[PDB]
Amino acid sequence: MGLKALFFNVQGTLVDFYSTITREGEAFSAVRGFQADWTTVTEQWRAEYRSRLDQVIKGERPWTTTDRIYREALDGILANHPWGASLNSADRDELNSLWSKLIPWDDTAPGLARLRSKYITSTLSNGSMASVLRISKLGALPFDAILTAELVRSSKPDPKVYQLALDSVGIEAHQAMMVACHKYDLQAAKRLGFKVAFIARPFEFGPNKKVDTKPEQYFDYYANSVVELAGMLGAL
Amino acid sequence: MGLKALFFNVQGTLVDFYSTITREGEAFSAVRGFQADWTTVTEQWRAEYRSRLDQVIKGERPWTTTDRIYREALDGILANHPWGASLNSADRDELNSLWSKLIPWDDTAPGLARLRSKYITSTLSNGSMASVLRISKLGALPFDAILTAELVRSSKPDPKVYQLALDSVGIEAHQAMMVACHKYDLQAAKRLGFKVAFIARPFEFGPNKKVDTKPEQYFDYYANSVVELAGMLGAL
Ligand SMILES: [Ca+2]
């Protein structure tokens, strides 16, 4: 009746989406004969995705997978760059696939392996199952299971998403820990009886953007990396 | 558009529940001072389990976790054994827990690792997520995802379960292969457009029981082990 299972937020917490979109974006445009400010594209793409996802959650748009939202969001932001109209549909599919390739932080894979030697480990992502399984496979990120909010057609912080984790692994809330670099996610899990571990990710939005990494009173654990979290849990 | 993902039946195809039941049951019964015919127990237990899954599909029984199905099936078969009435509910709980501890065939883990190096791999099981995750973890069975019929509150051969596989991994039916040692499973998947691979398991019910390992014309592959299947798919 101690901690039995750890559940992980994927974007930010485990993978560096900023460096993926900006560096692969630059390689993508170079091969095609143009250049662009990919930091701006990345920010615009993320913001447009979140606005469309919000419309799904509010019922103003029909339900669809996060991969499709990313792909429709891409069409939207490309209309504000003069080179955007030069990308055909296959070009935009390839760019959209980067969200299924988000690279790990350099602590993520070894920390995850150590944690798995002691606990059941699983994602609990807001994204599509297809994208998350590929992120984990491409990153060689070990998990006992892949779960995402898509399996209950919802989004965090809907309690159904957290309960999906408990039901799927067969444990009670106090035996589960939510691990994230986003406080809204940990707040919701804590209110449902999960233990919570915060991983500080000071470069989540790139090298130059200040991120809120300060500790909070309700965190069970405060860590600077997945490797550090494994140490404090005695998973050596 | 080429094979992208393999989906595995787990009990029987990948893990040897007969050896697990006979070995655990033998120890279970020795400490209680009686002997049982564990070959017959295994046959009856799986048959009652399958009959109850069918009731879930037919709606004669509301969906419950497969571990509750195994537990109630055990109550049913224990009326056919004189020692069965000597087992209280806690005894029966202990015996039921073996369904999350099934031992892999010797070829399963190396074959699964080779296939994962070439394809996306996933379970697609009727067992609970909790049990199948734990079977895979205890047996060091590598997968890119753990899917079970629990995620759509049904059971194979319900078409919803095969669609769950395609939606979750994000591929089309012809890009997916169902792998099983049971023909009902491959027949249903083939009818939905999957490729299918049969793995012969002549000792699924021990050395004294005959099982159907004959090939069929609709099998895309017929193999005697997961390693042999990996050889056939160019994964070695
Ligand atoms: Ca896995």
Author numbering:
A (entry chain A), B (entry chain B): 40 to 275
Paper lines:
Microbial epoxide hydrolases, cis-epoxysuccinate hydrolases (CESHs), have been utilized for commercial production of enantiomerically pure L(+)- and D(−)-tartaric acids for decades. All these three CESH[L]s exhibit high sequence identity (>60%) with L-2-haloacid dehalogenases, which are members of the haloacid dehalogenase (HAD)-like superfamily. Studies have shown that both RhCESH[L] and KlCESH[L] adopt a two-step catalytic reaction mechanism by 18O-labeling studies.
We also constructed an inactive mutant, KlCESH[L]-D48N, to obtain the enzyme-substrate structure because D48 was proposed to be the first step catalytic residue. The first step was proposed to be a nucleophilic attack on the carbon atom in the oxirane ring by residue D18 in RhCESH[L] and residue D48 in KlCESH[L], forming an enzyme-substrate intermediate and opening the ring with an unidentified proton donor. However, the binding of non-catalytic ligands, including sulfate ions and products L-TA, did not cause significant structural changes.
